Protein: Aspartate carbamoyltransferase, putative
Organism: Trypanosoma cruzi
Amino acid sequence: GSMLELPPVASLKGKSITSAEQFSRADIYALIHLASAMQRKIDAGEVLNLLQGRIMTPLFFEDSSRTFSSFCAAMIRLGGSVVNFKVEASSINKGETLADTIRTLDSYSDVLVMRHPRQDAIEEALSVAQHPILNAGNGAGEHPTQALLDTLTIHSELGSVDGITIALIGDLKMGRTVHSLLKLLVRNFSIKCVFLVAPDALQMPQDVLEPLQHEIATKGVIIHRTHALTDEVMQKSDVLYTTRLQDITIDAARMRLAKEKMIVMHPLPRNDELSTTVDADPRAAYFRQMRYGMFMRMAILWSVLA
Amino acid sequence: SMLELPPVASLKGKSITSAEQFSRADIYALIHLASAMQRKIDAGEVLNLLQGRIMTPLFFEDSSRTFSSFCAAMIRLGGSVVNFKVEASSINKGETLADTIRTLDSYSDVLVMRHPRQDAIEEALSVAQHPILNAGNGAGEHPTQALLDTLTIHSELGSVDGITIALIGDLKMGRTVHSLLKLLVRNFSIKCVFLVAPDALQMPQDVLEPLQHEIATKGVIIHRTHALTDEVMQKSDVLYTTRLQADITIDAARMRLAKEKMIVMHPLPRNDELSTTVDADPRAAYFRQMRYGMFMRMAILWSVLA
Amino acid sequence: ELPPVASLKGKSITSAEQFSRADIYALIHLASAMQRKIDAGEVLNLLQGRIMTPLFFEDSSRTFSSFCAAMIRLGGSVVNFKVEASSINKGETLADTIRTLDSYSDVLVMRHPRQDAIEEALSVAQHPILNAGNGAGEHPTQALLDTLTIHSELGSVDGITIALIGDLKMGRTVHSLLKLLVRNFSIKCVFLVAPDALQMPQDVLEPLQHEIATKGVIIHRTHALTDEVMQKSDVLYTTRLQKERFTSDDAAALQSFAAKADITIDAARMRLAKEKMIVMHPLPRNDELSTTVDADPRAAYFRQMRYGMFMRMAILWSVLA
Ligand SMILES: N[C@@H](CC(=O)O)C(=O)O
Ligand SMILES: N[C@@H](CC(=O)O)C(=O)O
Ligand SMILES: N[C@@H](CC(=O)O)C(=O)O
């Protein structure tokens, strides 16, 4: 993988990342090819020193296993460093405001990775930070880097993103991952069809679907709402993208209905909506998805900080 | 390297426990080293001075600035951090402080220690082979805060001799003001100090009494006030305020009385004693102060470890 | 100058049993070489771009810090994963957690209160896992650094008389150490010094019974540091009461440590010890090992931690080379 270039995606330079809306099709493909090259070099055991002396600081005001770790791992595999700030062992116990906390980490860091239970917290953070903030999840709003890594996953596993039928399953109302993913897919690709699979109370919100209306109509994207993984959903979907609470269960029995050429995805963590009986299936892409996450995050950090 | 970033020789291999241990020449050499670190980092240069050396933080109480600042400064020097947490440690199995110290001392080149007991630093020093840097010992001292505070004054105003400074808030329990008063009065010709606090929270007699010889021979003027009077507002070149862990609040209305060229400083975190209405004022130096902190800690770490 | 121990390459470390004598000596010599270079101030860049992720489900000072420090001094990096701040709060299983960190890491360092958690991790992990403690089971890298300590301090492991003292029932350190010494060395004598309720378990001794017999290793049980134990032992290896592993059963076991044994090591007790010997303790200690011993040249339990770092460098390099 030695002779591969790592050209940073120029449109990302020095910018905060808050929404799937900010990326073009050209941006997404450029990040995919960058991530794929990162992967090749890392897997061949090559050592990258692109971000030596640059600091990422995680600011996680709620729990994370993969997003936090993969961001740290991505930064370190670029040669960068991480300052391990913790909210519970911080001056927030002494009454410190969110804005003062941002200005603090912003004094030391080159990039901030922020996850917060309030949707409006990223906005507040942007209004005071000088360095880029990467949105690692803002309440029930968005998770833009999850959308990007999810798209890398589809592209690598199936070989194409245009033309797919995808089911978004579970808690679509509160799921920030399905919010960013729908936006990123519909805005930039020629999606055939989207099944919105959720109980009525947990359906995809209007504030996501409405801004997409022009794109949905002009590209002819077929939207279908169901409250179950029906035979039709199982038989037509190239991607079953399921999510946690926050019948739609996927187990081996259910998988007998799926196409040979398809993938099951889940941003994780999972509960019983996605059974361990699916794990040995070649079509279970939800573990590989995490490793794709680290490479996408390397492509993003290098592009942001180059 | 020895030209651009000469280490301050007097600090080599030494523990830092008190503002008292520094001379005027030490402070100026640190200040000049910190500005050179600043210039190199802000120009994007990568420093490799402490590769292979380990700092370990030992924080028995919370910190946002001091912990992060020290970690960043170590990293920006090319050194590394072992992220020890007291709450996830063998202290829960009955391990003493002395044994904890010997433990981290077996792996580390420098320890950074914050503890709610004033004498805990002295116990740690009796067993440690490697330097310990006091990041706060009860209501005792915070010597690196006084150093970065003095760098902040020097950089913003252009000199430290001749200033009128107000120390405002909980002066009794404020380890920052204890160290700062000591550092300033011992080593500079301070014109006037205002100690702005009710008698119940006034500067301790055990800080004032040992400064007797320097107050006398440099003719430093010192007055107590209970409130932030108009005289204090009009005469002060530096308003240094702190968390009362009446009538001491600095807001945009109070600022209308301040000199045109002065700074407002605060070691942080703040409560209502320092209104956010002041944050847009160019005189508000308490965010820049944190960044000076990182460069001062780089100058300290490099001098101690070179 | 720092050749990795080839037999360890790419392999998980779960038990003292997986090591041969040649493996132990090659690790010791590699560890001593790491120590010479680190002490001379040399900077190593052997694992640049490799990541270790600590997965600690219980408390640690030495083991966690030592592994991180060892990784760093090899030029490697750490992803500081925190169990209490993870998706485990949202219901994520152990296996899914393992798969997660395994997606980003080159090596996992795992400590868990359940003895069988390490095996479950192994069945799903692609990258090597290092057992940093599995319940009251084993602490294999402790056993290695302890043998490094005995070797460096006394100059020989074969022929020693060793007392294993304290909570032998819940002591994963003495479990691993007893297995490592007996399988790979000609130990002259082992004193098992504990109250009956905390004695070395049968599931440790029985698999060792063949080696004990055919090597002629003397095993004695006592509940006290008698004159005989003090006068004959080349090493006194003492341990903490493992309270966190402990009903009236529990209460009986817990108080037996002071009530049904006489096993404190203090300066007065040390007046009976040989001139050429060491006192060891994996740490942390409570009152079983008095601070009056710390000034004694024979107190090796602080130097033991530093040997720990060098053994862990030799191990990490050997696993990841
Ligand atoms: N972990 C993802 C989805 C989930 O929580 O299941 C998120 O934080 O958005
Ligand atoms: N945080 C600083 C100052 C303050 O608490 O106001 C200290 O810990 O000393
Ligand atoms: N720290 C060692 C010994 C002890 O805990 O007492 C262990 O974890 O096994």
Observations:
- Residues 301-320 of chain C form the longest helix (20 residues).
- The interface with chain B takes residues 42-44, 56, 59-62, 64-66, 68-69, 72-73, 75, 78, 80, 82, 84, 240, 243-244, 283-286, 291, 302, 305-306, 308-309 of chain C (CB under 8 Å).
- The pocket of aspartic acid (ligand 3) is lined by residues C 133, 139, 172-173, 239-240, 282 (CB under 6 Å).
